[PDB]
Design a protein around this ligand. Structure first.
Ligand SMILES: CC(=O)N[C@@H]1[C@@H](O)[C@H](O[C@@H]2O[C@H](CO)[C@H](O)[C@H](O[C@]3(C(=O)O)C[C@H](O)[C@@H](NC(C)=O)[C@H]([C@H](O)[C@H](O)CO)O3)[C@H]2O)[C@@H](CO)O[C@H]1O
Ligand SMILES: *[C@@H]1O[C@H](CO)[C@@H](O[C@@H]2O[C@H](CO)[C@@H](O[C@@H]3O[C@H](CO)[C@@H](O)[C@H](O)[C@@H]3O)[C@H](O)[C@H]2NC(C)=O)[C@H](O)[C@H]1NC(C)=O
Ligand SMILES: *[C@@H]1O[C@H](CO)[C@@H](O[C@@H]2O[C@H](CO)[C@@H](O)[C@H](O)[C@H]2NC(C)=O)[C@H](O)[C@H]1NC(C)=O
Ligand SMILES: *[C@@H]1O[C@H](CO)[C@@H](O[C@@H]2O[C@H](CO)[C@@H](O)[C@H](O)[C@H]2NC(C)=O)[C@H](O)[C@H]1NC(C)=O
Ligand SMILES: *[C@@H]1O[C@H](CO)[C@@H](O)[C@H](O)[C@H]1NC(C)=O
Lengths: 172, 321
């Protein structure tokens, strides 16, 4: 993908995560745990549902048209009837092939984007209390109990609370 | 004593391959099919008015082949012609068959209004053992075979103005005898002629005496023609022999009616889209079933499958085996 998070700096996905598309894994004093991020998950799905509804958007209702199978050799007029239909089909076949190509390239890039958007948002929460290990993991430089972890996940983490504690551990 | 927080994304055991700009195959968590490639095998009788031709082509129903008399005044959104169909009246041809078939199929109706044509000095309602109707000889229901009265066939010259506000379709014909004996025996004059005209157009057909292949008891043929008469116009029929006269006109509608060749059975269900293979769903944008379609259908394409990614890139963990 364009952002290089998925299949990129994040080595792989988690088959374990069955309750969401993107999310968190932690290790602290109290153990390890896993929780999915609802907002980023919902943004990816909404965008994909958005394009899905657009693609399956019914157009095209046709009634009397031209004949397309023939029991007799006739020549010029039939050559043209066949050519017109064969031309059409090839153009619609191309539109279909291109549509999926574009749509799927974009679907991959936008899901890669949403992973990256969550990562950049999280890093910004942690300010100077953590550092990017480079593999999608932040090493946090303080005691972060399960209350603190959940604060990062539900968006209430105050970085000033742990700042002096963390700054010291980073440069000592 | 610190703590680590890892960001990541889901994966699945069974991924799906898709095509992209850069990859002809690449694995994603889920995809959905955009090409409808299967049918029920059956043409759903709703919501379109399906008319099963059974033993009859639309044209034989039009003309009134006796075994097609059950189709008199019928209507349809889709007339369905079966491969088992056969003609069983006088042997005939239609110069520009395709066009008459199309214009009627589009009209969506065989509504026939009888008109009081006056054919002075000729025998009417001729018939043949080629076209049985009950036990005795008969003929096409919407055509009127005219032969001599006594020993004379006068110049027929009749008019039928259109004072309605709809178009009239007249179906008529010309008889081609096999021998000169036959020509004279039926019509006196050694060469006939049929001229059918409106204000704007005209058609003149000379009959042609000669054998054709023996088909249903006759080496003769009838050729079929049509003339449409607009409101305020008039129809004139002038003939000194060989006329196969109309008995009236067919009413013409415009609308969503058509015709299809199929041997799929008709069933009780609801499907907007109909193919000759049977009805198909129209939830997908494309289809590989048949280029021939009727109704609200997916667009026909050559691909039997196209997967639309409905999920991210699927990356399972580094396998040790
Ligand atoms: C070698 C030979 O016999 N040659 C044919 C000869 O068979 C043919 O006779 C016709 O035979 C058919 C059956 O095959 C019919 O029985 C014809 O009679 C009828 C008919 O039923 O079709 C009688 C009917 O009353 C006639 N109707 C009118 C309105 O005139 C019709 C009609 O004239 C013909 O169908 C016109 O083509 O014929 C019977 O005549 C003769 C006929 O031309 O030709 C020999 O060469
Ligand atoms: C064959 O049949 C047609 C229709 O029945 C005949 O056509 C009619 O011919 C007459 C003259 O022969 C036309 O009459 C003229 O009408 C105008 C007014 O419209 C009048 O001012 C003239 O003085 C004249 O009388 C008539 O319009 C015409 N109508 C149509 C519909 O064609 C034709 O005469 C017949 N021919 C034979 C040989 O039987
Ligand atoms: C087909 O429908 C037409 C009407 O659309 C029928 O024609 C009527 O027939 C009656 C009885 O002979 C006449 O009195 C009327 O003049 C006709 N109606 C009109 C409007 O002209 C016709 O009989 C129907 N035929 C069949 C086989 O159902
Ligand atoms: C729909 O019907 C057509 C025929 O009516 C099927 O295509 C034919 O089948 C084989 C190839 O699979 C050939 O022998 C014929 O020449 C084909 N005809 C045409 C016009 O292509 C088609 O496979 C059917 N599809 C489904 C899904 O039932
Ligand atoms: C994946 O898409 C299919 C349609 O191809 C659908 O049946 C299913 O609901 C989807 N699965 C998941 C896990 O979202």
């Amino acid at each position: 993908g364009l952002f290089g998070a998925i299949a990129g700096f994040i080595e792989n996905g988690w088959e374990g995560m069955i309750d969401g598309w993107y999310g968190f894994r932690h290790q602290n004093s109290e153990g390890t745990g896993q929780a999915a991020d609802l907002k980023s998950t919902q943004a990816a799905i909404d965008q994909i549902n958005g394009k899905l509804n657009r693609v399956i958007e019914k157009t095209n209702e046709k009634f009397h048209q031209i004949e397309k199978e023939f029991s007799e050799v006739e020549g010029r007029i039939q050559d043209l009837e066949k050519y017109v239909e064969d031309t059409k089909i090839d153009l619609w076949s191309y539109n279909a092939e291109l549509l999926v190509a574009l749509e799927n390239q974009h679907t991959i890039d936008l899901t890669d984007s949403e992973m990256n958007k969550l990562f950049e948002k999280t890093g910004r929460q942690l300010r100077e209390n953590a550092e990017d290990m480079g593999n999608g993991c932040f090493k946090i430089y303080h005691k972060c109990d399960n209350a603190c972890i959940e604060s990062i996940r539900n968006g209430t983490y105050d970085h000033d609370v742990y700042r002096d504690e963390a700054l010291n551990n980073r440069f000592q | 004593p610190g703590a680590t927080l890892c960001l990541g994304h889901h994966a699945v055991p069974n991924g799906t391959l898709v095509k992209t700009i850069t990859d002809d195959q690449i694995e994603v968590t889920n995809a959905t099919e955009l090409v409808q490639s299967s049918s029920t095998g059956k043409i759903c009788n709703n919501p379109h008015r399906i008319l099963d031709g059974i033993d009859c082509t639309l044209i034989d129903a039009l003309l009134g082949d006796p075994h097609c008399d059950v189709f008199q005044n019928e209507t349809w959104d889709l007339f369905v012609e079966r491969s088992k169909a056969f003609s069983n009246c006088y042997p005939y041809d239609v110069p520009d068959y395709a066009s008459l078939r199309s214009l009627v199929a589009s009209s969506g109706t065989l509504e026939f209004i009888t008109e009081g044509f006056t054919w002075t000095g000729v025998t009417q309602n001729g018939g043949s053992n080629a076209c049985k109707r009950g036990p005795g000889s008969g003929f096409f229901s919407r055509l009127n075979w005219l032969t001599k009265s006594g020993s004379t066939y006068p110049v027929l010259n009749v008019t039928m103005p259109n004072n309605d506000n709809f178009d009239k379709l007249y179906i008529w014909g010309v008889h081609h005898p096999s021998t000169n004996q036959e020509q004279t025996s039926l019509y006196v004059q050694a060469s006939g002629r049929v001229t059918v005209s409106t204000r704007r157009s005209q058609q003149t057909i000379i009959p042609n005496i000669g054998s054709r292949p023996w088909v249903r008891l006759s080496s003769s043929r009838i050729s079929i023609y049509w003339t449409i008469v607009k409101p305020g116009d008039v129809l004139v029929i002038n003939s000194n022999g060989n006329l196969i006269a109309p008995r009236g006109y067919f009413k013409m509608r415009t609308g969503k009616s058509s015709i299809m060749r199929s041997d799929a059975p008709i069933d009780t269900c609801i499907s907007e889209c109909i193919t000759p293979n049977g009805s198909i769903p129209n939830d997908k944008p494309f289809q590989n079933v048949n280029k021939i379609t009727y109704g609200a259908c997916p667009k026909y394409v050559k691909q039997n499958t196209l997967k639309l990614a409905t999920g991210m890139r699927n990356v399972p963990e580094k396998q040790t085996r």
